[PDB]
């Protein structure tokens, strides 16, 4: 009844075996005296590629982007004290956006814990609030089970970050003794939802990050939309779950979503919410959100159908008339076989009409002045669509550029969208891109960052050049700011600068054509504008604020 797999192994040897048991091939971290027994056991092991960023915050964001592309937990390995506390921001971000992440951090020897020794911090207590679950391995015999629980927790339910505090004397010890050794929702409720969907006069699908959990999600979302002739809209984190070049596809919905998705969501009598928490930046004003769904529910002819795996997110912001607790990709599996195709020409026509009457628009740079920001994204969308949209992964910082990427770049590929939407951490774009390019080295990994966001993590370009990680940085600048060209080429990023629409296609092509194993920055002198459409404070979604030439 005893397990001998780990007898005679040190803490780091137990560790690398536990990493292999979880198909962990890529780790991110930073060394330190409190985690050296574990650091030297992984760096020098050839099973794991190790990436040493310039900041432990980068490691966490690099693990986030790595986890978004490769739907598997990003492993982080930082030292105690300052090292671990630097990962607090990336850790809360993973928890806010549901990113699988496992943080192993060092700690002083167990006899020094609590003595406020050198580099001792209550890491288990600091991470406690911002992590899904944490633990401090108090004896080496606990190490294999605590790691199993760490990965299990980080990857089940709504994915999230976990932190495992590793004392120096525990991981430097030797274990001289053995140790003891996708489900859908309720069938009748799924059936109830399908029958409500089939009888719906004008339904809408609302896709979130939960659809991207399994590669079968978007395949079944396409099936639900085709077999039901139902339009689809997505959260900012649902980008890629549905092919936006589909005519059925409304685009992103929310504060800065598309006017047609904001309009159609308010007219729809049935909501098919698939793995989405109803953020305040999605609903606008909670009581005014989906009034046609609210009224259709009062008469029993429709309402909100909610597929969530976390019970705390059901009926937490919007009363769902048919809650379907469970995995959405598994719930969809029993759903789309019960969807009967019905004529919805009028409904699609209504949406397609508004989709052509209120598109994302903007007055282009009339003269030869600085670029309008939408022009830089539109040229990227055109050239990426020609090069092959499936070959692209795109990350962003947090700012105006983040919304431009959601508005003027068309999203087609599942798990090709790496942005901070829950916490909104600026500087996320560059390390997450470095983590994305690591999970998919063969793909065009583009980072759409702004001058302020890029400035919070720009030193990680040195990490991209050191490891031949060819991230292609699309930098939006407006002006107090440095010379980002000389800045980038300081650390090996052979960047260049563009400044005119007539100049834009050549610079965009040369920037995409650059060596995929060599980082490059395309700085764009951009005239920052406002973001339209927008939802004012305390206004409904259909009280949207399109303005340029649509008032």
């Amino acid at each position: 009844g005893l397990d001998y797999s780990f007898i005679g192994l040190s803490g780091g040897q137990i560790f690398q075996e536990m990493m292999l048991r979880h198909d962990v091939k890529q780790v991110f971290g930073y060394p330190g005296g409190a985690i050296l027994p574990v650091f030297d056991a992984i760096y020098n092991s050839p099973h794991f590629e190790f990436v040493l960023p310039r900041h432990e915050q980068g490691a966490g964001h690099m693990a986030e982007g790595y986890a978004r592309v490769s739907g598997k937990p990003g492993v982080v390995l930082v030292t105690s004290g300052p090292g671990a506390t630097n990962v607090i921001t990336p850790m809360q971000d993973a928890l806010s956006d549901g990113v699988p992440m496992v943080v192993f951090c060092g700690q002083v020897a167990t006899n020094l814990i609590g003595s406020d020794a050198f580099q001792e911090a209550d890491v288990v207590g600091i991470s406690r609030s911002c992590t899904k679950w944490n633990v401090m391995v108090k004896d080496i015999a606990e190490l294999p089970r605590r790691i199993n629980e760490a990965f299990k927790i980080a990857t089940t339910g709504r994915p999230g970050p976990v932190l495992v505090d590793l004392p120096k004397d525990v991981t430097a010890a030797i274990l001289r003794t053995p140790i003891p050794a996708p489900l859908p929702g309720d069938a009748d409720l799924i059936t109830e939802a399908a029958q409500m969907i089939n009888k719906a006069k004008r339904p809408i699908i609302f896709a979130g990050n939960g659809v991207l959990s399994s590669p079968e999600g978007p395949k079944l979302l396409k099936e639900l939309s085709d077999k039901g002739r139902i339009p689809v809209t997505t959260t900012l984190q649902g980008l890629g779950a549905f092919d936006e070049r589909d005519e059925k596809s409304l685009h992103m919905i929310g504060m800065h979503g598309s006017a047609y998705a904001n309009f159609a969501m308010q007219e729809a009598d049935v909501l098919i919410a698939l793995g989405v928490r109803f953020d305040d930046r999605v609903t606008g004003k909670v009581d005014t959100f989906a009034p046609a769904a609210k009224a259709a529910a009062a008469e029993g002819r429709g309402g909100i159908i909610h597929f969530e795996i976390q019970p705390k997110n059901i009926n937490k912001i919007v009363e769902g008339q048919i809650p379907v607790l469970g995995d959405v990709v598994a719930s969809l599996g029993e759903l789309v076989p019960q969807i009967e195709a019905v004529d919805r020409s009028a409904w699609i026509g209504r949406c397609k009409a508004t989709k052509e009457r209120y598109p994302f628009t903007y007055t282009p740079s009339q003269e030869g002045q600085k670029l309008k920001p939408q022009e830089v994204v539109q040229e990227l969308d055109r050239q990426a669509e020609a090069l092959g949209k499936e070959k692209f992964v795109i990350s962003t910082g947090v700012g105006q550029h983040q919304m431009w990427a959601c508005q003027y770049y068309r999203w087609t590929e599942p798990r090709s969208w790496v942005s901070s939407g829950g916490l909104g951490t600026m500087g996320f774009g560059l390390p997450s891109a470095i983590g994305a390019k690591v999970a998919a080295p063969e793909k065009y990994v583009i980072d759409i960052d702004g001058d302020a966001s890029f400035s919070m993590t720009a030193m990680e370009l040195a990490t991209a050049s050191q490891y031949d990680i060819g991230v292609k940085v699309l930098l939006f600048n407006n002006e107090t700011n440095p010379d980002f060209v000389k800045l980038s080429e300081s650390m090996g990023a052979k960047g260049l600068r563009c400044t005119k629409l007539e100049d834009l296609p050549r610079m965009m092509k040369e920037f995409l054509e650059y060596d995929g194993k060599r980082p490059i920055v395309l700085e764009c002198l951009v005239s920052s504008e406002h973001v339209y459409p927008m939802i004012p404070a305390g206004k409904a979604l259909h009280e949207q604020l399109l303005h340029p030439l649509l008032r």
Partner: protein
Amino acid sequence: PRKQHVLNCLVQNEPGVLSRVSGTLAARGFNIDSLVVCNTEVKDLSRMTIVLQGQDGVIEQARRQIEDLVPVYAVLDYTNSEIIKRELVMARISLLGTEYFEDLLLHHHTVAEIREKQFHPANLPASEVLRLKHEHLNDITNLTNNFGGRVVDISETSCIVELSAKPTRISAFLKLVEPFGVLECARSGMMALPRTP
């Protein structure tokens, strides 16, 4: 309607979950008015009762947030249900009376008139001090017997009473025994178990 709520949690008996559960309520700006937590017969499980004030709306989403926690297996909002409210209190009460009692109150912040009061022990023979300590003891015993309590310890100067009843009865008994001079007390905070009545 800021009402009082009682939460019963089945929770894992690992370190930190009290800090995690206590912190989850503090995130919402909740003051724990009382909390009781102990092991179950299952060594790796703990049951806890949490008492706080808030409107049912906010308290419900707080309860649903707590239940989401990994070490938390169930949280029941027993407030709007038939529960049995009880609370254990221990109290050490001086037998020397409100005269002498001020000396102690004065000297744990440090008297001329107080030590000249008629029924201060310095102005009384040793027996009337003995008789009055037992008279005060007899009053405290009759009082604690009437509420369903028990006199657990007796010393030369004081005594310890133990009482378990409704939290209303507990507050009433403490206020009722206050003028004897409560040296120190320890009430458990409200504990509850749902009833089928």
